Design a protein around this ligand. Structure first.
Ligand SMILES: *c1cc(O)ccc1O
Ligand SMILES: *c1cc(O)ccc1O
Ligand SMILES: *c1cc(O)ccc1O
Ligand SMILES: *c1cc(O)ccc1O
Ligand code: NI
Ligand code: NI
Ligand code: NI
Ligand code: NI
Ligand SMILES: [O-]
Ligand SMILES: [O-]
Lengths: 570, 100, 122, 570, 100, 100
C-alpha cells in the first residue's frame, strides 16, 4: 500500500525532501530526515493511533519511560537541523526527540517516548516547531510588552528596568540591590522567562558586584551612565569573577575615547556588543567594526532590520524627538547625521547574511519593537535571498543553510552569549520545553501556540463562549500556564551563581524555577552557531563606506517586505 | 445593557469589519484579517436578521471575491466560523473556502 | 510565481507504509445491525464480536491502512480487508483482554475468543 | 392595616400563591410558602428595619447566633421547593433559611439568623435565588471560559484539560500525575470551584490509580483514548476503590463492541454517561438507551438542547469540520449521518421532560457552550410546556413541578453524581454559600450577582467612575471575591480522599478550600432528584425511532426560542 | 490621548449604539441591549453638545418608541443612567421609562 | 483574524477617531483627545494606503487647523506619534506641532 506524497504531507506533515514556504517569503525549508516508521505515525483522535492497547501503552506508570506530553509529527527548524520528529516532554523538559508511541505493537519507538495513561497530546502535523526566542535586549518599561513578545514566539526576556523611569527608558538597567530585589518580585507575575541586568558603572568593584550578589544575571554598560574606560574595566572584572555576561552600548560621542580605546579597556575579555550597527548607540561612526573581533558577541536590534525605503526618515526623526534635538541647532543635526547612516545599515544586512553579526534582539520600547525580533530576522533573510541569491552552501534548491544561520540569531546564540544555553535556546534533549508551534502561512508572524515548561502559555484561539475553540474572534490569549501558581513552574528566573548560593530566592520568597547563569567568560565569536566569522571590518571615517576583505559592502533598501501588510490589521 | 464576555468581544469583530469596509471603499485590496472580519461580521448580522444557518453557509461564499483581496489571501482562508444568536438561540456557522 | 503563504512543494515519489511486513487478505462480515468502524492499529482478533471472520488470521495483525484511518462495515456488509503484522515486541495488552501478552499464544487467544462469543473461531 | 398584594410584592417580593414569569418564557413559578412574619419583614436602608436596637441586634458578638450575611426576602427556586425566605450565611456556608432579624423586638426570628454588628446585607426582594450551577462536562481549553460560565450562574466546573492541546480539545482529561499537579496549581487562579478528571484508560490498575492519588477527583473514559472493554473495566475498578465518579464517552464506532458490550464491561457499577443522546459521542445509533438503566447517571450536553430548525444543519457541519471529514468520502458522510440524528435529538427533549435524563452539562469548547447550560435547560422546559402542555402533576396553573425537575438537572443532580452534594448543588443549611441572584426578567440568561463562599465573585454592574454603580455600561465584572488571597477562601478544589490523606494540597502549596469527593459508588438513577425514571429505551437500528413503553417518542423542532434575540447583542 | 478607564469603557457604548443604529436602519425591531445602547450614547453625545441634564431627561424619553423595539422591551427598561462630561464637569443623567 | 495585542489596542484609536469625526460633523470644536484620535487614525490609515513616512509627516500638519479645536488645544499637542504597518513593515511616524 502506497500514499501519494501530497496526501502524505496533508495527513502527517511533510517528509524527507518535501519543501515548505516560510509565510509569504521566497524562503523554502526542506525536510532533511524523518524519525518516523512509515505506517506507524502517531496521531490522536477518533479511531486514531494513540488509543489504549494500540499506539498508547496501557501497562506503564508515568516513571516507566512514559511522557507527560507528545508533540506528534513536528517539522523542527533549529540550529541542529530541519527535520521531522515527535517531541517528548516530561517534568517540563524535552526528554526525547524521535518516535513516540507503544513498543508493544510499533516499530522504531524511542525507548523513553512511550505514550501512556499519563500522556497529553499536541498535534504538530503541518506545523513548524522552533525553540522559543531569546531576547537579550529588553527594556522593562510597560508590562503589556510581555504578551507582545509571546505573540511573536519570544519566551525569554533578558534586560533591565523598573518601568517608565528615564533610566529604564534609555538603558537595560535595574540599578542596585533594592531595585533588583523589587524587579525579581515583580517577575513572579510575568509569564515569560526573565534575567535582570544591573548597572555596569562604577570606579570601585563593590557597588557593581553587590548587584550580582543581589540577584542580577549580568550587567549593562550604557553611555547614558558613562561608558568610560573605568566603567568598562570594573564591569568586566566583576563579570569574570561572577561568571555573568556584560552587554555594552559604547560612547557614541567618543568623549573619553574612540572605538580603539573601548577595545583597549575590554582588553580581550568577552563582551556582548548591543545594536552593533550603531543606530541604536555606539562610537560614531565605526562601532560596527566590533563585529570582526574574536572576543565580541555581536547583536543587532530590530528597527534597522532590514534596510527599507522608510528606515532613514523614520530613524533620523525618532532620534531627534527622543533626544529633544532641534533641527535648527547645527551640533544636533551633525550628531544625528553621524549616528543614523544608510552606509552602515545597508552593510548590516550583508553582515547578517555572512554570519558576522551573530544575534538579533529587540531594544523593546527604548529603540525597538518587542514583538518583531523573529519577524524581522526572516524579512532580512528573505531580502538577502532576493538581492544576493541562494548562499553557495545551499543544495536541492532549498534555503536550509540560510534558515539555520538565521534561526540561530534569535534562539541558540543569545542563549550562549548570556550563559543560559544549558536550559533554553534550542530543541535538544535535556533542555526546558519552551516550544513555539507555527502554521507555515503565519511562520515568524503570529505564533499558533507557545509552550512554556511543557504547558501552553499563549495561543491564537477563538470565542471562549463557542461550542469549539476556532470561531471568531481568534486573537492571542494567555492560557492556563499563566494562571494561579502554574506561572511559577512554567517560567525561569535566571540569576548569578553567587545570588543563588547566598539564598536570594528564599530571602525574597521567589517561587519560580531558578536558572543558573554560567559558562559566559570562556566563549567567543567562534562559539556562535552558524555565525562564527571574524574579519577586519573597516568603516571609512569620511564616507562611512564599510569594507570586509577589501570589498565595499553596499546594498539597496527595498520598498516592500513580506510578513507585513498581508497579515496586520494596523 | 448587561453585556456578557462574548458580547464584549464580538463588538471588536463589528469594529474591524467597519474598518475593513472603509479600506475597501477607498479602493484597497483587503488583507487576511480584514477579509476575515468582513465575512465574520456578515455572518453575525445575518443571524441577527433571522437568516438560517444554511442561508449563511451559502451567502458567506459570495461576500468577497479573489479581486477584493491581496494575492494569497483566498488560499490562507480555509474557513471562517462564527457563533451568533439566531431566533432559535446560539448556532455555529462555518463558511468553507469563502473566497474562491 | 503566485505566492500561496506556507505552501508545500512535495518531492516526487510515493510512501510505502508497513514496508517489509507480511500482508494477508481476509473476508470479514458485519453480522450485526449497527455499523462498525475499525481503526488502523487495533489488534484485529479483538474487534467487535459480531464481525465474522477467521479469528486466527487476525492474531498478531492489524489493518494495512494509513495510520489513523479506519475500515467501515455497514450493517450486514461483507468485504475483504488487507492486514499487516504488528511490530515492536508483538505483545498486546487490554483492548478486549483476549491477549494480555505475546501474540504467539494463538491457542490461548482463540480459547478466550470462543468462550466470550467472538464470531469465527474455527 | 392591610397591604394590597401588588404593592406587597413590589416592596418585599412575592408571597404565598403569587406567580412570577421566568424571563420571556411561558413558565410560571408560584411561591409555595413564606417564612416571614407579615409586618416584620427584614429590609435595609434609610429609615428601614435593619438598624441598631430595631431589626439589627446591638448586643450579640459574632459567635452568638449572629450572621456574616443576610439575603433578605429571597424567592428560592431549588429541588427542595419554590418558597420565600431570608438566607443566612456564616463562615462562607448557608447556616439558616428562615427569618432574619432581631429577637429583641420581632416575632418568628430563626434563632441563628440574628442580624448583628457583624452582618452584611444583600437585598434579594424581587430576585430569584438559585444554587450555583454544577457543570460536570468542562474541557479546560481557554481560561476566558470561566467568566463565560459565571455570567450564566455556573459556580463549579468538573472536567479536564491542559489548555488547547488536542487531547484536551477532544476529551475532559488531565492526564497523569504531572499534568494533574500542574492544573491543580493553575486552579489557584480560577475564580470558580474545580474538580479534575484523569484519563480513564489503561490495562493495568497502577497508571490509572496514580492519577487519583495525585489529586484527580474522578476519571473520564473517552473513545479518542480507546473506550475499550479493558479501559472501562480498569477505570471502574479504580473508581470503586477510590470513591470517585467515572464519566464515559463510549465507542461511537462500535469498534470493540456495541452498547450491550459496554454495559457488560460496566457490569452493574455506577457510571456517569456524558451526552447520552449521542451527538456529542457514543455507540451509534443507540447510546441513548443507557438512560433507561438503574446504574447509569445520564447527562445531556447543551448544543442539542432543545431541538430547533438550525440544530441538524449546525451539528452535521460542526462534526464534519472538527473531524476533518470530507463531504465526497462516503464513509465520512455515513459516519456523520449515523451520529447526528433528528430522531434521537427530538426524543432527548421528551426524555428530559419525563425525568429519564437527569442532568445537563456544557461540553464547554469541545462540543458545547460554557455559558448556556442554565439558558438551554429553561429553553427546553419552555418548549416542552408549549408542545406537551403542563405536566399532569402541576396544580394552581403553575409550572412548579417542571421547574423543580429542570432546576435539579444543573444543580443537585450533577453534585450527587460527582460525590460533592455534601458541599454544593442546593440551597440547604450546612452547604457552601454558592448563590446566584437573578432579576426575573433575566432569569436563566444573565446572572445579577454570583456569590461564592459568601462573598460576591461576579456581578452585572456599571461604570466604576460613576457616582452610583448602575450607570452604563452595565456588564459582567469580577468582584472582590476574585481578588488577592480572597480567591482562595471563596472557591473549592475537589479532590479524591486518597490525595487528601497523602497531603497533596500541602505538597503543591494549594491555598484553596479543599473539598472531599465521596459517596459516588452506591448511588444510582433512583438518587437523581425529580429525574429518577428507569425504563426500557428501544432505538430502532434501521429508522433510529425511539420507543419507551411501546410509545414512539417524536417531537417537532421550533423556529424560535425565548431567552434569545430579546437579550443578546450578538 | 491620555484615556482613563471610564473613557475606554464608554467607547464601547458608542460602538454598540452604532451597531444598533445600523440594525434599526435595515428595518429590525431592536432588542434590550440595542435599545439601551442607543439611548445611552444619545445622552453622552448630548452632554458633549452642551445640553443640560434637564434637557436630556426630557429628550431621552423620545429617542425610541414602542414600535422601534421588540415586545416586552419597553417594560424591561425602567430607566437608563449615564454619566458624561458636561461643560460644568461630570453629571449623572437618569431617563425614567424611556420607551412608553 | 489572529489579532495580536497591538492590533486590538489600535482598533480603539480608529473608534475614537470615528466618534470625533461625528462630533466635528455636527459643528463642535474638538477637544484634546478627539484631535489626537483624528490625527493618529489618519496616520495609521495613510500607512495602510501605502504612503511614505515623509508624506505622512507633511500631511499630518494639515488634518486639523486651529479653528477645528477648542482654545489651547493646538498648544497642548506638541506632537503625535503612531506606528503602523507600511508596505515595508512597521514604522514610526512623528507629526510635529500638527495644529498651528
Ligand atoms: C519619548 C520617550 C522615549 O523614551 C524616547 C523617545 C520619545 O520621543
Ligand atoms: C544588497 C546586498 C548585496 O550583496 C547586493 C545587492 C544589494 O542590493
Ligand atoms: C476545530 C477545533 C476543534 O477542537 C473542533 C472543531 C474545529 O473545527
Ligand atoms: C414534541 C413532543 C411531544 O410530546 C409532542 C409534540 C412535540 O412537537
Ligand atoms: Ni543602546
Ligand atoms: Ni536599549
Ligand atoms: Ni464526549
Ligand atoms: Ni466533551
Ligand atoms: O539601546
Ligand atoms: O464530549
Amino acid at each position: 500500500m502506497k500514499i501519494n506524497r501530497q496526501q502524505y504531507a496533508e495527513s502527517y506533515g511533510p517528509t524527507v525532501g518535501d519543501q515548505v514556504r516560510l509565510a509569504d517569503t521566497d524562503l523554502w525549508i526542506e525536510v532533511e530526515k524523518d524519525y518516523t516508521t512509515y505506517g506507524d505515525e502517531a496521531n490522536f483522535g477518533g479511531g486514531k493511533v494513540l488509543r489504549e492497547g494500540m499506539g498508547e501503552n496501557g501497562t506503564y506508570t508515568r516513571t516507566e519511560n512514559v511522557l507527560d506530553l507528545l508533540l506528534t509529527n513536528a517539522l523542527i527548524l533549529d540550529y541542529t537541523g530541519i527535520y521531522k520528529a515527535d517531541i517528548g516532554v516530561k517534568d517540563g523538559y524535552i526528554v526525547g526527540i524521535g518516535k513516540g508511541g507503544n513498543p508493544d505493537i510499533m516499530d522504531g519507538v524511542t525507548p523513553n517516548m512511550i505514550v501512556g495513561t499519563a500522556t497529553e497530546v499536541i498535534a504538530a502535523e503541518g506545523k513548524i516547531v522552533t525553540a522559543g526566542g531569546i531576547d537579550t535586549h529588553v527594556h522593562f518599561i510597560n508590562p503589556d510588552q510581555v504578551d507582545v513578545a509571546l505573540a511573536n514566539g519570544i519566551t525569554t526576556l533578558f534586560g533591565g528596568g523598573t518601568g517608565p523611569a528615564e533610566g529604564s527608558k534609555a538603558t537595560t538597567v535595574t540599578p542596585g540591590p533594592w531595585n533588583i530585589e523589587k524587579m525579581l518580585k515583580s517577575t513572579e507575575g510575568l509569564p515569560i522567562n526573565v534575567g535582570i541586568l544591573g548597572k555596569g558603572h562604577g570606579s570601585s568593584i563593590a557597588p557593581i558586584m553587590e548587584q550580582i550578589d543581589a540577584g542580577a544575571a549580568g550587567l549593562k554598560i550604557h553611555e547614558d551612565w558613562g561608558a568610560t574606560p573605568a566603567s568598562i574595566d570594573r564591569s568586566l572584572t566583576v563579570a569574570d569573577e561572577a561568571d555573568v555576561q556584560v552587554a555594552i552600548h559604547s560612547d557614541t560621542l567618543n568623549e573619553a575615547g574612540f572605538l580603539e580605546d573601548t577595545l583597549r579597556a575590554i582588553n580581550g575579555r568577552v563582551i556582548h556588543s548591543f545594536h552593533v550597527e550603531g543606530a541604536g548607540g555606539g562610537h560614531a561612526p565605526d562601532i560596527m567594526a566590533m563585529a570582526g573581533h574574536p572576543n565580541v558577541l555581536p547583536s543587532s536590534t530590530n528597527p534597522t532590520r532590514p534596510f527599507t525605503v522608510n528606515t532613514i526618515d523614520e530613524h533620523l526623526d525618532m532620534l531627534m524627538v527622543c533626544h529633544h534635538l532641534k533641527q535648527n541647532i547645527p551640533e544636533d543635526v551633525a550628531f544625528a547625521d553621524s549616528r543614523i547612516r544608510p552606509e552602515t545599515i545597508a552593510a548590516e544586512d550583508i553582515l547578517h547574511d555572512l554570519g558576522i553579526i551573530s544575534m538579533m534582539s529587540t531594544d523593546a520600547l527604548a529603540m525597538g519593537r518587542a514583538g518583531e525580533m523573529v519577524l524581522r530576522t526572516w524579512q532580512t533573510a528573505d531580502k538577502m535571498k532576493k538581492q544576493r541569491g541562494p548562499l553557495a552552501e545551499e543544495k536541492n534548491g532549498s534555503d536550509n543553510f540560510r534558515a539555520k544561520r538565521y534561526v540561530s540569531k534569535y534562539t541558540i546564540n543569545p542563549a550562549i552569549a548570556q550563559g543560559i544555553a544549558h536550559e533554553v535556546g534550542s530543541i535538544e534533549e535535556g533542555k526546558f520545553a519552551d516550544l513555539v508551534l507555527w502554521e507555515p502561512k503565519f511562520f515568524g508572524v503570529k505564533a499558533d501556540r507557545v509552550i512554556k515548561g511543557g504547558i501552553i502559555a499563549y495561543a491564537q484561539i477563538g470565542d471562549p463562549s463557542a461550542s469549539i475553540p476556532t470561531p471568531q474572534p481568534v486573537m492571542g490569549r494567555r492560557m492556563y500556564g499563566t494562571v494561579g501558581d502554574l506561572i511559577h513552574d512554567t517560567n525561569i528566573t535566571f540569576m548569578s551563581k553567587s545570588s543563588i548560593q547566598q539564598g536570594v530566592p528564599a530571602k525574597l520568597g521567589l517561587k519560580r524555577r531558578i536558572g543558573t547563569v554560567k559558562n559566559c567568560r570562556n566563549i567567543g565569536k567562534k562559539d556562535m552557531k552558524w555565525n562564527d566569522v571574524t574579519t577586519d571590518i573597516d568603516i571609512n571615517p569620511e564616507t562611512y563606506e564599510v569594507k570586509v576583505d577589501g570589498e565595499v559592502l553596499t546594498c539597496e533598501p527595498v520598498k516592500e517586505l513580506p510578513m507585513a501588510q498581508r497579515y496586520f490589521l494596523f | 445593557m448587561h453585556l456578557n464576555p462574548a458580547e464584549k468581544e464580538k463588538l471588536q469583530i463589528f469594529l474591524a469589519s467597519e474598518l475593513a469596509l472603509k479600506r475597501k471603499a477607498r479602493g484597497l485590496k483587503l488583507n487576511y484579517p480584514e477579509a476575515v472580519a468582513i465575512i465574520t461580521s456578515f455572518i453575525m448580522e445575518g443571524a441577527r436578521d433571522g437568516k438560517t444557518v444554511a442561508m449563511l453557509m451559502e451567502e458567506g461564499k459570495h461576500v468577497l471575491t479573489r479581486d477584493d483581496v491581496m494575492e494569497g489571501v483566498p488560499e490562507m482562508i480555509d474557513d471562517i466560523q462564527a457563533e451568533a444568536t439566531f431566533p432559535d438561540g446560539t448556532k455555529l456557522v462555518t463558511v468553507h473556502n469563502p473566497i474562491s | 510565481n503566485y505566492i500561496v503563504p506556507g505552501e508545500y512543494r512535495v518531492a516526487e515519489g510515493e510512501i510505502e507504509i508497513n514496508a517489509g511486513r507480511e500482508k494477508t487478505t481476509i473476508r470479514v462480515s458485519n453480522t450485526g445491525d449497527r455499523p462498525i468502524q475499525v481503526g488502523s492499529h487495533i489488534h484485529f482478533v479483538e474487534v467487535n464480536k459480531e464481525l465474522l471472520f477467521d479469528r486466527a488470521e487476525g492474531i498478531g495483525r492489524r489493518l494495512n491502512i494509513p495510520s489513523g484511518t479506519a475500515a467501515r462495515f455497514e450493517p450486514g456488509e461483507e468485504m475483504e480487508v488487507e492486514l499487516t503484522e504488528l511490530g515492536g515486541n508483538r505483545e498486546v495488552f487490554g483492548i478486549s483482554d483476549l491477549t494480555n501478552g505475546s501474540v504467539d499464544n494463538k491457542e490461548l487467544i482463540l480459547q478466550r475468543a470462543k468462550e466470550l462469543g467472538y464470531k469465527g473461531v474455527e
